[PDB]
Every structure is written in C-alpha cells, then in structure tokens.
Design an enzyme around this catalytic site. Structure first.
Site, short mmCIF file in Angstrom:
data_model
loop_
_atom_site.label_atom_id
_atom_site.label_comp_id
_atom_site.label_asym_id
_atom_site.label_seq_id
_atom_site.Cartn_x
_atom_site.Cartn_y
_atom_site.Cartn_z
N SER A 243 3.98 42.61 38.97
CA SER A 243 4.84 43.74 38.67
C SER A 243 4.02 45.01 38.39
CB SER A 243 5.76 43.43 37.50
OG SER A 243 6.82 42.58 37.89
N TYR A 246 3.09 47.53 41.07
CA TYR A 246 4.16 48.47 41.44
C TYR A 246 4.24 49.69 40.52
CZ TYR A 246 5.47 44.84 44.76
OH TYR A 246 5.48 43.92 45.77
N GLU A 327 8.96 35.30 42.72
CA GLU A 327 9.77 36.50 42.57
C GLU A 327 11.23 36.09 42.44
OE1 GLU A 327 10.07 39.10 46.54
OE2 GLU A 327 7.98 38.72 45.96
O1 LIG Z 1 13.88 45.75 42.60
C1 LIG Z 1 13.83 46.46 43.59
C2 LIG Z 1 12.82 46.13 44.66
C3 LIG Z 1 11.47 46.07 44.28
C4 LIG Z 1 10.46 45.77 45.19
C5 LIG Z 1 9.01 45.72 44.75
C6 LIG Z 1 8.82 45.23 43.32
N1 LIG Z 1 8.74 46.14 42.40
N2 LIG Z 1 8.57 45.72 41.09
C7 LIG Z 1 8.47 44.46 40.63
O2 LIG Z 1 8.31 44.24 39.44
C8 LIG Z 1 8.55 43.41 41.66
C9 LIG Z 1 8.46 42.06 41.33
C10 LIG Z 1 8.55 41.10 42.32
C11 LIG Z 1 8.72 41.46 43.65
C12 LIG Z 1 8.81 42.80 44.00
C13 LIG Z 1 8.73 43.79 43.01
C14 LIG Z 1 10.81 45.52 46.51
C15 LIG Z 1 12.14 45.56 46.92
C16 LIG Z 1 13.11 45.87 45.99
F1 LIG Z 1 14.39 45.90 46.41
N3 LIG Z 1 14.66 47.52 43.76
C17 LIG Z 1 14.71 48.45 44.90
C18 LIG Z 1 14.62 49.89 44.43
N4 LIG Z 1 15.67 50.16 43.44
C19 LIG Z 1 16.66 51.08 43.54
O3 LIG Z 1 17.49 51.23 42.65
C20 LIG Z 1 16.71 51.94 44.77
C21 LIG Z 1 16.91 53.38 44.56
C22 LIG Z 1 17.95 52.65 45.02
C23 LIG Z 1 15.53 49.27 42.28
C24 LIG Z 1 15.65 47.82 42.72
#
Ligand SMILES: O=C(c1cc(Cc2n[nH]c(=O)c3ccccc23)ccc1F)N1CCN(C(=O)C2CC2)CC1
Length: 350
Positions: A243, A246, A327
C-alpha cells in the site's frame, strides 16, 4: 489561532496544499497552462474516462493504429498534456489505458480537494486550518503513542513490510483515529458480517482531502474496467509496503499518508489473475487476490472484534499466481469503515 493538535494542523496543511496538487498534475504530464487547477471539472474527467473506454474497445478489437490515433487525440483534447508543438505519445495499448485511468482517478480526487478549498465560506477572524478541517466532515484525533492500539498499529507496520520493498524503511510519525460523518451508519448492514479485517490503503497525499470528505469511492461507470486488475472497486492490502508504494513518495517528498480501514470481506472470491468484473458472483461480498506471500495466520489479533493480520510474511502455498502479495477488493462503498490515518516518513536506502 487554531486550538487543534499540532499533528492534526500539519495534516490539514499537507492535504489542502495547492502546490502539491499542481505537482501531482505535472507528474501525469498535464499542461497546466492549457488546463490549470481551476479549470478541472467532474464532467471533463468523466468525458475523458469515456474516451479512454473507447480506446479500451479499439485495443481489444485489434483496430488499426490509424483508427486509434483519433481516439488517442480526443483524450488529449479533453485532458491537455504538456508536449508543446510536438505530437503526443499514442494511447494504443492496455498499459497506456491503465496509466491514463490512474491519472483520471487522481484528477477526480484533486478536483474534490480544490472545490472544497474554493467553496464554502471565507472568514479572516477564523484560522484557515480550522475552516479547512471542518470542510472534511471527519473527526480527526491523535492516537496516544503509549496506547495499546498504537502498539498494535506499529507492530502491523513493522511486521508487514516486504523484502521486495526494501529500497525504503518506514517510520510512523503520527497515528490518527478518524471518524467520517455518517460512515458508521452507512456500514451498519455489514457491521456484523463475517471476515471483517483491518486493512491498508495507500494513496497520494493530494487525494486525502477527497477521501476524508467523500470516503473511498469506486471509479465511475465511464471508467475503463480493463484498466483495473479486478475491476472497479476499493483495493486493500495486508502488507503495509504494498500500500505504501501507492503513496508515491520520493527523496524530494518522503512524507506519505496511509489508511487503516475495517473492510467487511465476507465470502471472498479468490482469484490468481486479472479479472475485469463488473459484478461479483452470487453469494460473494469481496475478491481476494491470492498472493505468494501472506501474513502468518496464527499471528492474527483482534482489535475491537476486527482481525488484524499483523503476522510476518510467510509462503501461502498458492502456485501460478500473478501476485506476490494479497489484495482485497470490495464493490460497494458501504463495505468500508475508515479507522486510522497514518503519517509516515519514507527513509529511502537507495
Ligand atoms: O482502490 C482503488 C484502486 C487502487 C489501486 C492501487 C492500490 N492503491 N492502494 C492500495 O493500498 C492498494 C492495495 C492493493 C492493491 C492495489 C492498491 C488500483 C485500482 C483501484 F481501483 N480505487 C480506485 C481509485 N478510487 C477512486 O475513488 C477513483 C476516483 C474515482 C479509489 C478506489
């Protein structure tokens, strides 16, 4: 002057910083002269998401590069990029779709932060920190360093830092107990659902004003589902370092923010590879991306009836998977209850 704790005040300054928002846009190669912070709108980002969804169609149906050129140029028309009098790079692959979808996810959160800061009321008598804090509609409290919950959180940070993420070590500066207005009421149908875990969610500092005021959201219907590994949902990790990547911190900006949210996972749909789903199969409440490494299941603890997978990384016994770490993805915003906000210092060893 503000009566709020100094760490709470520093948090507000950090997330409402306009120059950091501009810096994040520059990172994504956006032309700030053609499209400054003020010109950003929910509508423009949505229209660009839809043009990106069209690029998603051309890439999958093996369309000609001369037919993808007009779809690529349309995206640049809606979202101006800093390339001057040169031709911009061609959005002709799934990687370019993913990268531009991530940018638009951030632009949507940056727009929320800027609208909050430019909307509302201006009062010289009141401290600007107090005014901006109220705009978040979130009760932010400093967790006492010597408390049991602080010890649990620090152990979680210490133990779930992966070996493949050793370019930096993590120092917990502040632990904030957060309570978003109406979020507990929203989480009520899932409050007693089984498999509730306290999981990590890392994001750029420039997204936290949007996250604290509106909560963790899901990418809009206009967003390309193929640009998201397990579809449009809210992603979490049981490893702090996964996390923390990111947070997009550098040597020039080593301070990041991470969330600890109670996620009602329930019956998990266990997946090993990319699955761009629009809906979960019947009887499933979440998706578990099966990683090669998992925190020790015997080392799990219970903080307020919620499982804390603070165990050290061990082999899961999962063969033929595209993920090194687990995840967790939920597809209903009501399935998340944000509990903690951590301010971390990234000590880059490179
Ligand atoms: O949680 C995610 C997300 C995150 C990621 C990367 C990520 N970001 N952060 C993490 O802690 C994480 C943990 C495990 C796996 C991936 C991550 C990839 C695709 C996704 F859809 N979101 C997508 C972006 N978000 C939004 O509200 C977008 C603006 C409309 C918030 C929700």
């Amino acid at each position: 002057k503000s009566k709020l704790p100094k760490p709470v005040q520093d948090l507000i300054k950090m997330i409402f910083d306009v120059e950091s928002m501009k810096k994040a846009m520059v990172e994504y190669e956006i032309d700030l002269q053609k499209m400054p912070l003020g010109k950003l709108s929910k509508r423009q980002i949505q229209a660009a998401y839809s043009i990106l969804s069209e690029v998603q169609q051309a890439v999958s149906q093996g369309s000609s590069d001369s037919q993808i050129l007009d779809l690529s140029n349309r995206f640049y028309t809606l979202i101006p990029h800093d390339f001057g009098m040169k031709k911009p790079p061609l959005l002709n692959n799934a990687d370019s779709v993913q990268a531009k979808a991530e940018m638009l996810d951030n632009l949507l959160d940056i727009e929320v932060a800027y609208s909050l800061l430019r909307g509302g009321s201006d009062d010289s008598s009141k401290d600007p920190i107090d005014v901006n804090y109220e705009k978040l509609k979130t009760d932010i409290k400093v967790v006492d360093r010597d408390s049991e919950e602080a010890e649990i959180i620090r152990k979680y940070v210490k133990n779930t830092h992966a070996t493949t993420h050793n370019a930096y070590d993590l120092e917990v500066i502040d632990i904030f107990k957060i309570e978003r207005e109406g979020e507990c009421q929203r989480y009520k149908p899932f409050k007693q659902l089984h498999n509730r875990r306290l999981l990590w969610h890392g994001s750029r500092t420039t997204n936290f004003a949007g996250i604290l005021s509106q909560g963790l959201r899901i990418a809009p219907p206009e967003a390309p589902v193929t640009g998201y590994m397990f579809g449009k949902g809210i992603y979490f990790a049981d490893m702090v370092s996964k996390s923390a990547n990111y947070c997009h911190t550098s040597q020039g900006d080593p301070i990041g923010l991470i969330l600890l949210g109670e996620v009602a996972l329930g019956n998990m749909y266990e997946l090993k590879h990319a699955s761009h789903i629009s809906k979960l199969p019947k009887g499933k409440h979440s998706v578990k991306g099966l990683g090669k490494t998992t925190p020790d299941p015997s080392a799990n603890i219970s903080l307020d009836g919620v499982d804390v997978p603070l165990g050290t990384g061990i082999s899961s016994g999962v063969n033929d998977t595209s993920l090194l770490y687990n995840e967790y993805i939920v597809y209903d915003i009501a399935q998340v209850n944000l509990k903690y906000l951590l301010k971390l210092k990234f000590n880059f060893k490179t």
